[PDB]
Amino acid sequence: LQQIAHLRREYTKGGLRRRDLPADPLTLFERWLSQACEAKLADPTAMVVATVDEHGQPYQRIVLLIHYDEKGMVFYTNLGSRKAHQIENNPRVSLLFPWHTLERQVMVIGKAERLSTLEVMKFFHSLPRDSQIGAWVSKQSSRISARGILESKFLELKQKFQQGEVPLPSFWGGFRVSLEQIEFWQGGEHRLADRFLYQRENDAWKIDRLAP
Amino acid sequence: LQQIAHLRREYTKGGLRRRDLPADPLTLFERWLSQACEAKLADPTAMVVATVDEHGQPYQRIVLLIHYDEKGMVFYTNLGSRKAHQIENNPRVSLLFPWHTLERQVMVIGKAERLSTLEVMKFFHSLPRDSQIGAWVSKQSSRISARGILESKFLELKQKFQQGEVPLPSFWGGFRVSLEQIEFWQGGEHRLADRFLYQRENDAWKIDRLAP
Ligand SMILES: Cc1cc2nc3c(=O)[nH]c(=O)nc-3n(C[C@H](O)[C@H](O)[C@H](O)COP(=O)(O)O)c2cc1C
Ligand SMILES: Cc1cc2nc3c(=O)[nH]c(=O)nc-3n(C[C@H](O)[C@H](O)[C@H](O)COP(=O)(O)O)c2cc1C
């Protein structure tokens, strides 16, 4: 708890100049994610996902980043959830990594596309057994009349699955968010943040500094 | 750093039952905000604000909560920023308090309205002198060709204001987000979160538990 405090002070010694930026924004994201992990932030892979309903109202919630590469950033969710309904009507989403403990933010803008069954199955059968079970329990985002509904169904499903592999719910899936824009924010001198926007354009990245 | 660790363990000993909920959601928000402050989270008042552009694309960034009451939650920003432009075309916003260090989230849905000059002036002239200056420096969200633009203007404005009260920029203002919905999330038993939605309806709050 002094080792962690020290690491956070070192990773917060930030300037951020254009000439030190990598060509691929995911190189910088990888570096900051590794620092969030080493500094033991709570849930370093946690990201706030924003979606928009049919009335133009934005909604937000935290999800975990499970995978990223050039094709985008992946999370898993219940396909009957509010976020899945909103994505089906409007695939435009924003992701924000709230790394303000290290004076950082990352924001990703892109379109969410569903994962295939093969991808979902691979991830599901990597989860701890008790995570597989919980995925069955909850009709995510529906009104429920009592907490006991969850607790009862959890007990029943434990009993039902006890002596086999936990099957994949038909209602569990995932989304990959394309990399149209990636924005980096790092606290800077005189409380003037360094801010860079990577914009995907003509199979390349256009980088601009933004005023904070 | 053992005192903080202990406080975080105590405030994370959560069950959340309907019968223990306050009538006014801001009573529970006040309690969780006070706990985030006592546990020394980074920026306990930090909230992620989501807005939507004219194409239906959501955007996100962190701002600080400055004030809250029944009329809504207040933040300050530069009126030429992307968020201010997006609000002018679509006043629907979401706020999320990323308190996952204490296994919590709070989300607020409502409409953003501008603050009056008298309100903006009162807050501006409470800021530290060096905060007043910085508010002049940056054409928030515009592309800038170099970091030095910020550093130069900061030095010039320091010199210009040295021996007087720092005047209020015409381009600095704020927004109050109405309380249409407030949602509380707290990590729960068997990794099944307690989730409650307060929905404003007929001059009252309708509370429902949501499945996690
Ligand atoms: C740290 C943390 C991680 C979470 N990870 C996920 C996740 O990966 N997927 C998911 O569906 N919900 C996750 N949740 C729950 C969501 O925030 C949200 O409550 C749920 O997905 C329902 O969102 P919706 O009603 O807007 O669709 C997480 C919550 C927290 C606090
Ligand atoms: C902890 C923290 C607090 C911040 N507080 C504010 C704020 O209160 N107001 C503000 O305009 N920007 C604030 N920012 C900067 C915003 O996240 C964002 O970079 C800026 O407002 C531009 O957003 P826009 O280009 O989307 O309009 C904060 C950033 C962090 C990391």
Residue numbers in the entry:
A (entry chain AAA), B (entry chain AAA): 7 to 218
Direct quotes from the study:
By using FMN as cofactor, PNPO catalyzes the oxidation of both pyridoxine 5’-phosphate (PNP) and pyridoxamine 5’-phosphate to PLP, reducing molecular oxygen to hydrogen peroxide. We recently showed that an ePNPO quadruple variant (K72I/Y129F/R133L/H199A; ePNPOqm), which has a drastically reduced capability to bind PNP (and therefore PLP) at the active site, is still able to bind PLP at the allosteric site.
We crystallized this quadruple variant in both the absence of PLP (ePNPOqm) in P31 2 1 space group and presence of PLP (PLP-ePNPOqm) in P61 space group. The final model of ePNPOqm was refined to 1.56 Å resolution; the asymmetric unit contains a 212-residue subunit (residues 7–218; the entire polypeptide chain is made by 218 residues), one FMN molecule, two sulphate ions, one phosphate ion, and 174 water molecules. The second subunit of the dimer was generated by the crystallographic 2-fold axis. In addition, in the PLP-free ePNPOqm the N-terminal region is also visible, folded in an additional α helix (H0, residues 5–18). The β sheets core region is flanked by H1 (and H0 in PLP-free ePNPOqm) on one side and H2 on the opposite side. In this structure of ePNPOqm without PLP, the interactions between two key residues of H5 (subunit A; Arg153 and Glu157) and residues Glu195, Leu198, and Asp200 placed on the 192 to 200 helix (subunit B) are particularly important to maintain these structural elements linked together and correctly folded. In the ePNPOqm structure, the Arg197 displays a position similar to that of the wildtype protein. No PLP is present at the active site of either structures, although PLP-ePNPOqm was crystallized in the presence of excess PLP (see Experimental procedures section for details); this is evidently a consequence of the engineered active site variants.
